[PDB]
Design a protein around this ligand. Structure first.
Ligand code: GDP
Length: 192
């Protein structure tokens, strides 16, 4: 049960992270995948910025939850015409985070449920595997998947992500609430 959510750190440079406390989980995915919307659904409040147009990579944001854990919002990758400077910033921040944040318990990798897994997502998977970073796949935007196509598409994500490694796969919709409570429970378990 999430009681309190506070934005406490906007990290713009490597290593500018708050004290580890009791642990944390992180969220990442392609820009526009629905990360801010998912965070808001999890927090049960509008706090992360939602938009049809993806924001530039600028920071890693730390949300202090119940005064003892963090939900960490990593910047989205790909999509926009990411300039050299922006991708370098992206790489610089996320790599620093992965390599140095020992208290990270789990990364939730958000991917669009509506289409099959894509190359940049698979690259993300390979990278975290190489860094020994645990991760769980979260499918987003499930409310837009035709009921008659849900089975095929879910199997496709399962098949693809099984050729690799993973913690589990949770379909979600920030619109209907599908999977939100299941994701919350898994997080509570990982943290406690
Ligand atoms: N139908 C639907 N739209 C969503 C869902 N999640 C996000 N969106 C929309 O997708 C667009 C991107 O959302 P956003 O949360 O800002 O993505 P972000 O760039 O990953 O943080 C927005 O227009 C959202 O309204 C979802 O579960 N269902």
């Amino acid at each position: 049960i999430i009681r309190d959510v506070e934005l406490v750190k906007v990290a713009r440079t490597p290593g500018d992270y708050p004290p580890p406390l009791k642990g944390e989980v992180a969220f990442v995915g392609r820009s526009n995948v629905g990360k801010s919307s998912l965070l808001n659904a999890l927090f049960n409040r509008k706090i992360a910025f939602v938009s049809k147009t993806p924001g530039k990579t600028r920071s890693i944001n730390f949300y202090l939850v119940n005064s003892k854990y963090y939900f960490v919002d990593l910047p989205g990758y790909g999509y926009a015409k990411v300039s050299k400077k922006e991708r370098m910033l992206w790489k610089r921040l996320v790599e620093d985070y992965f390599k140095n944040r020992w208290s990270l318990q789990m990364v939730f990798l958000l991917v669009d449920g509506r289409i099959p897994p894509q190359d940049s997502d698979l690259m993300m998977v390979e990278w975290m595997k190489s860094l020994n970073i645990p991760f769980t796949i979260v499918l987003t935007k499930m409310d837009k998947v035709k009921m008659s196509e849900r089975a095929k598409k879910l199997e496709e994500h399962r098949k693809v992500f099984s050729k690799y490694g993973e913690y589990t796969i949770i379909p979600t919709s920030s619109v209907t609430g599908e999977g939100i409570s299941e994701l919350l429970d898994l997080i509570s378990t990982l943290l406690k």
